[PDB]
Amino acid sequence: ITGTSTVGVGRGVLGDQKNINTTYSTYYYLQDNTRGNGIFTYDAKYRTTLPGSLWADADNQFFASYDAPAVDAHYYAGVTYDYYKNVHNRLSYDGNNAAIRSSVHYSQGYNNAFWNGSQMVYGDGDGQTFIPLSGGIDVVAHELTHAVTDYTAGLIYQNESGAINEAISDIFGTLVEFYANKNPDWEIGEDVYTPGISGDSLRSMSDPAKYGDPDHYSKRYTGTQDNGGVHINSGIINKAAYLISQGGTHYGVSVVGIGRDKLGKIFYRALTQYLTPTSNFSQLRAAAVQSATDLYGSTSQEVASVKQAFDAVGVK
Ligand SMILES: CC(C)C[C@H](NP(=O)(O)CNC(=O)OCc1ccccc1)C(=O)N[C@@H](CCCN)C(=O)O
Ligand SMILES: [Ca+2]
Ligand SMILES: [Ca+2]
Ligand SMILES: [Ca+2]
Ligand SMILES: [Ca+2]
Ligand SMILES: [Zn+2]
């Protein structure tokens, strides 16, 4: 909407106060004009018709329980935009400052979040398995990263290419969580998963097997559930990424860690310069090796560590 840029205040899903960029024109809207061509947050009003209505508020204060998922979807989309711009010189998901749109309060009891080809969508959860999913910064960044992937490598959402697609979203979701630097970890979704159980998460990158996901190519799933295991076999790539950053010895193979920033540079370059819609795990290894060679040199520790990490997870 046309209006003037304003700054509101509210509380997110976990009860934390934050400022949000809004737009005033009769109402205050969740429209942040400070980033690209805008970040826009919508109310889906418990229905499944998208996007719903651009979020409107009478007083620019967002402290109602119903407001909390919108506050966080809006704010964490801004953090994710900032990560891609400041760290990777990427302007929004398409590289040309496309408007970023999210809808919250999607459906009833909906235990998921997704990119629908055009926008982000967040359920409220059923209150037992999940609380409103935009409360997780790793979740929000996971979803926006699907848009980045779709505009760049275009990884098809099935089998090995789809597991790479998933891992890319978990990797950058985690790197955005570290960028914001609030309780960062190598777990996925911990802030919104199972409010009645402490210390768990939906997936682990540091130890995928903790939640039943493979940590070695020999343990990959090859059935048809979950689009051929896209959220299962992602563990193999998530583990490799964790090892590249943090190091470790895994199935007897030692990896010297090179840190999160270099992990992010290598995988961002692989995603945007080398991967294709049908890349498999072996092709990802080659893309990561080439990316690290471009950035750091063929004889570098960074290249050697990429090779060790993929060796450790059984990907040649
Ligand atoms: C980070 C977590 C909290 C959310 C994440 N959701 P996602 O991977 O972005 C779901 N996207 C998806 O399916 O895209 C395909 C598509 C949909 C619509 C239109 C076009 C294409 C996820 O890991 N979901 C799991 C766990 C879900 C537990 N109930 C899961 O779906 O099995
Ligand atoms: Ca209000
Ligand atoms: Ca965390
Ligand atoms: Ca996390
Ligand atoms: Ca929990
Ligand atoms: Zn995903």
CSV table of C-alpha atoms and ligand atoms in Angstrom, one decimal:
chain,number,residue,atom,x,y,z
A,1,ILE,CA,0.0,0.0,0.0
A,2,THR,CA,1.0,3.6,-0.5
A,3,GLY,CA,1.8,5.3,2.9
A,4,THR,CA,4.6,6.5,5.1
A,5,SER,CA,7.1,4.3,6.8
A,6,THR,CA,6.6,3.8,10.5
A,7,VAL,CA,8.0,1.8,13.4
A,8,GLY,CA,5.7,-0.3,15.6
A,9,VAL,CA,6.4,-2.5,18.6
A,10,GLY,CA,5.2,-5.9,19.5
A,11,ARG,CA,5.8,-9.2,21.1
A,12,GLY,CA,6.7,-12.4,19.2
A,13,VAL,CA,5.6,-16.1,19.8
A,14,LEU,CA,8.1,-16.6,22.6
A,15,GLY,CA,7.1,-13.4,24.4
A,16,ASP,CA,10.1,-11.2,23.4
A,17,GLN,CA,9.6,-7.6,22.5
A,18,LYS,CA,10.9,-6.2,19.2
A,19,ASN,CA,10.4,-3.2,16.9
A,20,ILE,CA,8.8,-3.8,13.4
A,21,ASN,CA,8.8,-1.7,10.3
A,22,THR,CA,5.3,-0.8,9.3
A,23,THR,CA,3.4,1.5,6.9
A,24,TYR,CA,0.8,4.0,7.9
A,25,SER,CA,-2.2,4.8,5.7
A,26,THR,CA,-5.3,5.0,7.9
A,27,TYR,CA,-4.2,1.7,9.5
A,28,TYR,CA,-0.7,0.5,10.4
A,29,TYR,CA,0.2,-2.3,8.0
A,30,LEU,CA,2.9,-5.0,8.3
A,31,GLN,CA,4.7,-3.6,5.3
A,32,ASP,CA,8.5,-2.9,5.8
A,33,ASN,CA,9.6,-0.5,3.1
A,34,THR,CA,13.2,-0.4,4.4
A,35,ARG,CA,14.3,-3.6,2.6
A,36,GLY,CA,14.2,-4.0,-1.1
A,37,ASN,CA,10.7,-3.7,-2.6
A,38,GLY,CA,9.2,-4.4,0.7
A,39,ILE,CA,8.4,-7.2,3.2
A,40,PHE,CA,4.6,-7.8,3.5
A,41,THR,CA,2.9,-9.9,6.1
A,42,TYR,CA,-0.7,-11.2,5.8
A,43,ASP,CA,-3.4,-12.7,8.0
A,44,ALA,CA,-4.8,-16.0,6.5
A,45,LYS,CA,-7.4,-16.0,9.4
A,46,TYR,CA,-7.3,-19.8,10.0
A,47,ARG,CA,-8.2,-20.5,6.3
A,48,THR,CA,-6.3,-21.9,3.4
A,49,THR,CA,-7.0,-19.1,0.8
A,50,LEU,CA,-3.7,-17.2,0.2
A,51,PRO,CA,-2.4,-14.7,0.8
A,52,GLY,CA,-5.3,-13.4,2.9
A,53,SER,CA,-5.4,-9.8,3.9
A,54,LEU,CA,-2.3,-7.5,4.4
A,55,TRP,CA,-2.0,-7.3,8.2
A,56,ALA,CA,-3.7,-4.1,9.5
A,57,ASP,CA,-3.5,-2.8,13.0
A,58,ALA,CA,-5.2,0.3,14.5
A,59,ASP,CA,-2.4,1.6,16.8
A,60,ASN,CA,1.0,0.2,15.7
A,61,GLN,CA,1.3,-1.9,18.9
A,62,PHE,CA,1.4,-5.7,18.3
A,63,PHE,CA,1.1,-7.2,21.8
A,64,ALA,CA,-2.0,-9.4,21.4
A,65,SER,CA,-1.6,-13.1,21.3
A,66,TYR,CA,-3.1,-13.2,17.8
A,67,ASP,CA,-0.4,-10.7,16.7
A,68,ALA,CA,2.6,-12.8,17.8
A,69,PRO,CA,3.1,-15.1,14.7
A,70,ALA,CA,2.8,-12.0,12.5
A,71,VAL,CA,5.4,-10.0,14.4
A,72,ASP,CA,7.9,-12.9,14.1
A,73,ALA,CA,7.2,-13.7,10.5
A,74,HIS,CA,7.7,-10.1,9.6
A,75,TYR,CA,10.8,-9.5,11.8
A,76,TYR,CA,12.6,-12.7,10.9
A,77,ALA,CA,12.0,-12.2,7.2
A,78,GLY,CA,13.8,-8.9,7.7
A,79,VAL,CA,16.7,-10.6,9.4
A,80,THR,CA,16.9,-13.2,6.6
A,81,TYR,CA,16.9,-10.4,4.0
A,82,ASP,CA,19.7,-8.7,5.9
A,83,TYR,CA,21.8,-11.9,6.0
A,84,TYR,CA,21.6,-12.5,2.3
A,85,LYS,CA,22.3,-8.9,1.4
A,86,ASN,CA,25.0,-8.2,3.9
A,87,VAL,CA,26.8,-11.6,3.8
A,88,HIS,CA,26.2,-12.7,0.2
A,89,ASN,CA,25.4,-9.4,-1.7
A,90,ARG,CA,22.1,-10.9,-2.7
A,91,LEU,CA,19.0,-8.6,-2.9
A,92,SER,CA,16.0,-10.7,-1.9
A,93,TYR,CA,15.3,-14.2,-3.1
A,94,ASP,CA,15.4,-13.4,-6.8
A,95,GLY,CA,18.5,-11.2,-6.6
A,96,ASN,CA,16.5,-8.1,-7.8
A,97,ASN,CA,14.7,-7.1,-4.6
A,98,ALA,CA,11.5,-9.0,-5.1
A,99,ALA,CA,8.8,-8.2,-2.5
A,100,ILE,CA,8.8,-10.8,0.3
A,101,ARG,CA,5.3,-12.0,1.3
A,102,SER,CA,4.3,-14.2,4.2
A,103,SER,CA,1.0,-15.4,5.5
A,104,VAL,CA,0.4,-16.5,9.2
A,105,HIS,CA,-2.5,-18.2,10.8
A,106,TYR,CA,-2.7,-20.6,7.9
A,107,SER,CA,-5.3,-23.3,8.4
A,108,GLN,CA,-6.2,-24.8,11.8
A,109,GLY,CA,-3.7,-26.9,13.8
A,110,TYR,CA,-1.3,-26.9,10.9
A,111,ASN,CA,2.1,-28.3,11.9
A,112,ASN,CA,4.1,-27.0,9.0
A,113,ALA,CA,5.4,-24.0,7.1
A,114,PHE,CA,6.2,-23.8,3.4
A,115,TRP,CA,7.1,-21.7,0.3
A,116,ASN,CA,4.2,-22.2,-2.1
A,117,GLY,CA,6.1,-21.0,-5.2
A,118,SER,CA,5.3,-17.3,-4.5
A,119,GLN,CA,5.2,-16.7,-0.8
A,120,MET,CA,5.9,-18.1,2.7
A,121,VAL,CA,3.1,-19.7,4.7
A,122,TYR,CA,3.1,-20.5,8.4
A,123,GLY,CA,0.8,-22.7,10.4
A,124,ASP,CA,0.0,-22.1,14.1
A,125,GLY,CA,0.7,-25.7,15.0
A,126,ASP,CA,-1.6,-27.8,17.1
A,127,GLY,CA,0.0,-26.5,20.4
A,128,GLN,CA,1.5,-29.9,21.2
A,129,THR,CA,3.8,-30.8,18.3
A,130,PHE,CA,4.4,-27.1,17.3
A,131,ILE,CA,3.6,-23.6,18.4
A,132,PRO,CA,3.3,-21.0,15.6
A,133,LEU,CA,6.1,-21.8,13.4
A,134,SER,CA,7.3,-18.3,12.5
A,135,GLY,CA,8.6,-18.2,16.1
A,136,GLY,CA,11.7,-20.0,14.8
A,137,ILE,CA,14.2,-17.9,13.0
A,138,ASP,CA,15.8,-21.0,11.5
A,139,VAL,CA,12.3,-21.9,10.3
A,140,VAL,CA,11.7,-18.5,8.6
A,141,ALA,CA,15.1,-18.6,7.0
A,142,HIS,CA,14.6,-22.2,5.9
A,143,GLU,CA,11.4,-21.1,4.1
A,144,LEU,CA,12.9,-18.0,2.4
A,145,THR,CA,15.9,-20.1,1.4
A,146,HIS,CA,13.5,-22.4,-0.6
A,147,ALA,CA,12.7,-19.3,-2.7
A,148,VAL,CA,16.4,-18.6,-3.2
A,149,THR,CA,17.0,-22.2,-4.3
A,150,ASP,CA,14.1,-22.1,-6.7
A,151,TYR,CA,15.4,-18.9,-8.3
A,152,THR,CA,19.0,-20.2,-8.5
A,153,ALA,CA,19.9,-24.0,-8.7
A,154,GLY,CA,16.2,-24.9,-9.0
A,155,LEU,CA,16.7,-28.3,-7.3
A,156,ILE,CA,13.7,-30.5,-8.1
A,157,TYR,CA,11.9,-31.5,-4.8
A,158,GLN,CA,12.4,-35.3,-4.9
A,159,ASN,CA,15.1,-37.9,-4.2
A,160,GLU,CA,18.7,-36.6,-4.0
A,161,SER,CA,18.2,-33.2,-5.6
A,162,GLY,CA,15.3,-32.7,-3.1
A,163,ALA,CA,17.4,-33.7,-0.2
A,164,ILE,CA,20.0,-31.2,-1.3
A,165,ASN,CA,17.2,-28.6,-1.6
A,166,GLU,CA,16.2,-29.4,2.0
A,167,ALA,CA,19.8,-29.4,3.4
A,168,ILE,CA,20.4,-26.0,1.7
A,169,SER,CA,17.4,-24.6,3.6
A,170,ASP,CA,18.6,-26.2,6.9
A,171,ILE,CA,22.1,-24.9,6.4
A,172,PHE,CA,21.1,-21.3,5.6
A,173,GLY,CA,18.4,-21.4,8.2
A,174,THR,CA,21.1,-22.3,10.8
A,175,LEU,CA,23.5,-19.7,9.4
A,176,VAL,CA,20.8,-17.0,9.7
A,177,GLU,CA,20.2,-18.2,13.3
A,178,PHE,CA,23.9,-17.7,14.1
A,179,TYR,CA,23.8,-14.3,12.3
A,180,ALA,CA,21.1,-13.1,14.6
A,181,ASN,CA,23.1,-14.7,17.5
A,182,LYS,CA,20.2,-15.6,19.9
A,183,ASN,CA,20.6,-19.1,21.3
A,184,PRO,CA,22.2,-20.3,18.1
A,185,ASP,CA,22.7,-24.0,17.5
A,186,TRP,CA,22.9,-26.7,14.8
A,187,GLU,CA,19.4,-28.0,15.5
A,188,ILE,CA,16.3,-27.2,13.4
A,189,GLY,CA,13.1,-25.9,14.8
A,190,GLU,CA,13.9,-26.2,18.5
A,191,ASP,CA,12.2,-22.9,19.4
A,192,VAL,CA,8.8,-23.9,18.1
A,193,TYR,CA,8.8,-27.7,18.4
A,194,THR,CA,7.1,-29.7,21.3
A,195,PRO,CA,6.6,-27.0,23.9
A,196,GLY,CA,6.1,-29.8,26.5
A,197,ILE,CA,9.5,-31.4,25.8
A,198,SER,CA,12.7,-29.5,26.5
A,199,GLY,CA,16.0,-30.1,24.6
A,200,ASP,CA,14.6,-31.7,21.4
A,201,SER,CA,14.1,-30.4,17.8
A,202,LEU,CA,12.8,-31.5,14.5
A,203,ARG,CA,16.2,-32.4,13.0
A,204,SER,CA,19.8,-32.2,14.1
A,205,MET,CA,22.6,-31.2,11.8
A,206,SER,CA,25.3,-32.1,14.3
A,207,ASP,CA,23.9,-35.6,14.9
A,208,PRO,CA,21.0,-36.4,12.4
A,209,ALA,CA,20.7,-39.9,13.7
A,210,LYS,CA,19.3,-38.5,17.0
A,211,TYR,CA,16.0,-38.0,15.2
A,212,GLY,CA,16.3,-41.1,12.9
A,213,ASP,CA,17.9,-39.4,10.0
A,214,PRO,CA,20.9,-40.8,8.2
A,215,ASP,CA,24.4,-39.5,8.7
A,216,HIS,CA,26.1,-41.6,6.0
A,217,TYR,CA,25.2,-42.3,2.4
A,218,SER,CA,25.1,-46.1,3.2
A,219,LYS,CA,22.0,-45.3,5.4
A,220,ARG,CA,20.1,-43.3,2.8
A,221,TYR,CA,16.4,-43.9,2.4
A,222,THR,CA,15.2,-45.0,-1.1
A,223,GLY,CA,11.5,-45.4,-0.7
A,224,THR,CA,8.8,-43.1,-1.8
A,225,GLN,CA,7.6,-41.4,1.4
A,226,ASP,CA,8.4,-37.7,1.8
A,227,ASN,CA,9.1,-37.2,-1.9
A,228,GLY,CA,11.8,-39.9,-1.7
A,229,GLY,CA,13.1,-38.9,1.8
A,230,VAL,CA,13.9,-35.2,1.2
A,231,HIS,CA,13.6,-34.4,4.9
A,232,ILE,CA,15.4,-37.7,5.8
A,233,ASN,CA,18.4,-37.9,3.4
A,234,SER,CA,19.0,-34.2,4.1
A,235,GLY,CA,20.8,-35.5,7.2
A,236,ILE,CA,23.7,-36.8,5.1
A,237,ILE,CA,24.3,-33.3,3.6
A,238,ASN,CA,23.6,-31.5,6.9
A,239,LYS,CA,26.2,-33.7,8.6
A,240,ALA,CA,28.7,-32.9,5.9
A,241,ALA,CA,28.0,-29.1,6.3
A,242,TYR,CA,28.3,-29.4,10.1
A,243,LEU,CA,31.7,-31.2,9.7
A,244,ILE,CA,33.0,-28.6,7.2
A,245,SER,CA,32.2,-25.8,9.7
A,246,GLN,CA,32.9,-27.4,13.1
A,247,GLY,CA,35.2,-30.4,12.3
A,248,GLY,CA,35.1,-33.8,13.9
A,249,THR,CA,35.9,-37.5,13.3
A,250,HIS,CA,32.9,-39.3,11.9
A,251,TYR,CA,33.0,-43.1,11.1
A,252,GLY,CA,36.8,-42.8,11.6
A,253,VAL,CA,37.3,-39.9,9.1
A,254,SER,CA,38.7,-36.7,10.5
A,255,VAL,CA,37.6,-33.3,9.3
A,256,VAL,CA,39.4,-30.1,10.2
A,257,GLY,CA,36.7,-27.4,10.7
A,258,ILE,CA,36.9,-24.1,8.8
A,259,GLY,CA,34.1,-22.2,10.5
A,260,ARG,CA,30.6,-21.1,9.6
A,261,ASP,CA,31.4,-18.1,7.4
A,262,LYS,CA,33.5,-20.2,5.0
A,263,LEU,CA,30.9,-22.9,5.0
A,264,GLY,CA,28.3,-20.3,4.0
A,265,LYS,CA,30.5,-18.9,1.3
A,266,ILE,CA,31.2,-22.3,-0.2
A,267,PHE,CA,27.6,-23.5,-0.2
A,268,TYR,CA,26.3,-20.1,-1.5
A,269,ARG,CA,28.7,-20.2,-4.4
A,270,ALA,CA,27.8,-23.9,-5.1
A,271,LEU,CA,24.1,-23.1,-5.0
A,272,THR,CA,24.3,-20.1,-7.3
A,273,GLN,CA,27.1,-21.1,-9.7
A,274,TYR,CA,27.3,-24.8,-10.0
A,275,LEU,CA,24.2,-26.8,-8.9
A,276,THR,CA,21.4,-27.6,-11.4
A,277,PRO,CA,17.8,-28.8,-11.0
A,278,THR,CA,18.9,-32.4,-11.1
A,279,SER,CA,22.1,-32.4,-9.1
A,280,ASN,CA,22.8,-35.5,-7.0
A,281,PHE,CA,24.9,-35.8,-3.9
A,282,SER,CA,28.1,-36.6,-5.9
A,283,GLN,CA,27.5,-33.6,-8.0
A,284,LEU,CA,27.1,-31.5,-4.9
A,285,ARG,CA,30.5,-32.7,-3.6
A,286,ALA,CA,32.0,-31.6,-6.9
A,287,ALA,CA,30.3,-28.2,-6.8
A,288,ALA,CA,31.5,-27.6,-3.2
A,289,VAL,CA,35.0,-28.6,-4.1
A,290,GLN,CA,35.0,-26.3,-7.1
A,291,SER,CA,33.5,-23.5,-5.1
A,292,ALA,CA,36.1,-23.8,-2.3
A,293,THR,CA,38.8,-23.9,-5.0
A,294,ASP,CA,37.5,-20.7,-6.5
A,295,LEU,CA,37.4,-18.9,-3.2
A,296,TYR,CA,40.5,-20.3,-1.4
A,297,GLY,CA,42.7,-22.1,-3.9
A,298,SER,CA,43.3,-25.7,-4.9
A,299,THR,CA,45.9,-26.4,-2.2
A,300,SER,CA,43.9,-24.7,0.6
A,301,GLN,CA,42.7,-26.3,3.9
A,302,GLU,CA,39.2,-25.3,2.9
A,303,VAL,CA,39.3,-27.6,-0.2
A,304,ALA,CA,40.9,-30.4,1.8
A,305,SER,CA,38.2,-30.1,4.5
A,306,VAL,CA,35.3,-30.2,2.0
A,307,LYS,CA,36.7,-33.5,0.6
A,308,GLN,CA,37.2,-35.0,4.1
A,309,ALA,CA,33.6,-34.0,5.1
A,310,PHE,CA,32.0,-35.7,2.1
A,311,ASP,CA,34.3,-38.7,2.6
A,312,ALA,CA,33.1,-38.9,6.2
A,313,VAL,CA,29.5,-39.2,5.0
A,314,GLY,CA,30.2,-41.6,2.2
A,315,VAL,CA,29.7,-39.3,-0.7
A,316,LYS,CA,32.3,-39.6,-3.5
B,1,LIG,C1,11.7,-26.1,9.1
B,1,LIG,C2,10.4,-26.9,9.4
B,1,LIG,C3,9.7,-26.5,10.7
B,1,LIG,C4,9.4,-26.8,8.3
B,1,LIG,C5,9.8,-27.5,7.0
B,1,LIG,N1,8.8,-27.2,5.9
B,1,LIG,P1,9.2,-27.2,4.3
B,1,LIG,O1,10.4,-28.2,4.2
B,1,LIG,O2,9.5,-25.9,3.7
B,1,LIG,C6,7.7,-27.9,3.5
B,1,LIG,N2,7.8,-27.6,2.1
B,1,LIG,C7,7.3,-28.4,1.1
B,1,LIG,O3,6.7,-29.5,1.3
B,1,LIG,O4,7.5,-27.8,-0.1
B,1,LIG,C8,6.9,-28.4,-1.3
B,1,LIG,C9,5.9,-27.5,-1.8
B,1,LIG,C10,4.8,-27.1,-1.1
B,1,LIG,C11,3.8,-26.2,-1.6
B,1,LIG,C12,3.9,-25.7,-2.9
B,1,LIG,C13,5.1,-26.1,-3.6
B,1,LIG,C14,6.0,-26.9,-3.1
B,1,LIG,C15,10.0,-29.0,7.2
B,1,LIG,O5,11.0,-29.5,7.6
B,1,LIG,N3,8.8,-29.7,7.1
B,1,LIG,C16,8.7,-31.1,7.3
B,1,LIG,C17,8.3,-31.5,8.7
B,1,LIG,C18,6.8,-31.2,8.9
B,1,LIG,C19,6.3,-31.7,10.3
B,1,LIG,N4,4.8,-31.8,10.4
B,1,LIG,C20,7.9,-31.8,6.2
B,1,LIG,O6,7.2,-31.1,5.5
B,1,LIG,O7,7.9,-33.0,6.2
B,2,CA,CA,-2.6,-3.1,18.0
B,3,CA,CA,18.4,-21.9,18.7
B,4,CA,CA,18.1,-23.9,15.4
B,5,CA,CA,10.5,-29.0,22.5
B,6,ZN,ZN,12.1,-27.3,3.5
